[PDB]
């Protein structure tokens with residue numbers, strides 16, 4: 262991959278692998294999500310961020326601050342097939358003191374058409390106490406030089422689905438998958454559960470018949486709390502709606518503490 | 531990737547990704563195993579095999595026969611770091627009417643040194659009845675033209691660890707991880723559990739302290755039966771010794787064996 266001419270965005274091409282695809286021979290939403298995080302990491306490396314484990318500026322490292330994902334929004338129009346080349350362009354934007362945003366645009370390398378788009382909201386947090394905090398001027402000045410100053414949105418639209426408030430699913434759930442546990446392959450280089458694993462867990466409670474007859478077009482996921490390596494998760498889903506919509510909830514198996522809430526929109530194959 | 535000059539082997543380069551590494555910032559053995567299967571798939575595509583879902587010759591497709599993994603053996607000397615380029619060379623060989631073998635050699639693209647090697651034994655089977663069959667002459671003649679005829683071994687050595695008989699672990703196990711279930715990400719394009727998931731399950735019963743202080747040098751795994759999408763697995767491990775372990779995966783309820791294996795770890 263490489264930074265674009267102005268050094269304000271980053272592009273990378275990927276060839277879809279045999280184990281990265283589902284029954285339709287096209288990349289799963291989890292493969293897409295992994296590719297988005299990889300291109301984000303390569304963008305941080307290309308602009309001087311160290312390979313320490315967490316992308317931090319000088320002030321962030323000094324104050325033990327890290328960026329953490331609070332919400333992820335992905336919309337796919339066409340999933341790349343096994344062997345196809347997908348091109349991903351990514352960039353970051355300061356959201357004042359609230360936090361920061363990373364956006365992505367997915368394209369078919371052969372036709373040049375937009376096949377998907379994504380956006381993620383990051384909030385600043387102390388690594389040790391897990392307490393959120395506003396972005397300081399010292400931190401903002403340090404990373405602002407790597408961002409476009411004028412607004413550049415992947416989801417420009419006025420009443421778009423990336424800014425909708427997600428309600429908490431009420432018991433009883435229509436569908437559920439219980440006893441979900443992370444294995445070592447679900448952990449990242451920092452021994453934390455990878456954000457993409459939560460997407461997989463959310464999708465585990467969607468009945469197989471919906472998966473076999475529909476394509477996932479939109480997924481919105483809020484991250485409230487982390488699943489530790491020794492935690493067990495219950496995945497809950499209720500249909501809210503040729504389109505099917507679902508409301509999702511991940512919670513700890515025992516006490517029922519919420520870890521994630523989300524929504525999915527599927528269209529008929 | 532591309533076939534080599536003689537068209538009898540295939541090479542491909544991979545850049546190690548951020549999510550593909552463990553806490554040492556080097557590729558996990560599961561990432562390596564995924565890369566080996568990917569380069570195997572690209573080799574089958576480059577020699578005329580269709581993208582149907584199972585690599586089959588004309589007579590295999592007619593008789594509903596598929597190759598299935600019976601044994602996988604991987605030895606790693608150095609794991610590639612995040613951002614490093616690993617080069618993998620792969621080839622197949624006829625093992626008479628017993629089956630087929632796929633071998634791999636892993637190299638550091640920058641230094642050119644061998645950083646790992648792997649071998650897998652495949653057996654032919656009817657995809658519907660699940661019954662193993664010997665390799666017929668019609669099938670042999672069809673794929674022999676894509677293999678070196680003289681022996682070419684990734685593990686040539688006599689008395690090497692890739693041909694050792696693995697015993698069945700006896701209860702009680704020293705360590706265990708119970709209630710393991712596959713999710714949709716563990717399935718392949720044919721809706722079967724990916725072979726690499728079994729490697730992950732085997733490793734789940736290795737205590738974390740061994741993982742934190744040792745590096746996995748060798749893993750030998752036998753595949754006896756598949757775990758279905760609605761099955762639950764128990765992973766069992768006992769130290770037999772460098773640290774050596776004997777492994778067993780079995781169905782959570784009836785205790786039917788799905789895999790047995792061994793691992794050898796080196797002190798960091």
Ligand SMILES: O=C(O)COCc1ccccc1
Pocket residue numbers: 298301302304305308310316353363404407408
């Ligand atoms: O996406 C990540 O993993 C980290 O990106 C940090 C960054 C990169 C470029 C510009 C601002 C911030």
Ligand SMILES: O=C(O)COCc1ccccc1
Pocket residue numbers: 570571573574577579585622632673676677
């Ligand atoms: O590794 C696979 O997935 C299938 O490879 C089949 C093959 C490829 C080349 C030569 C003989 C057989």
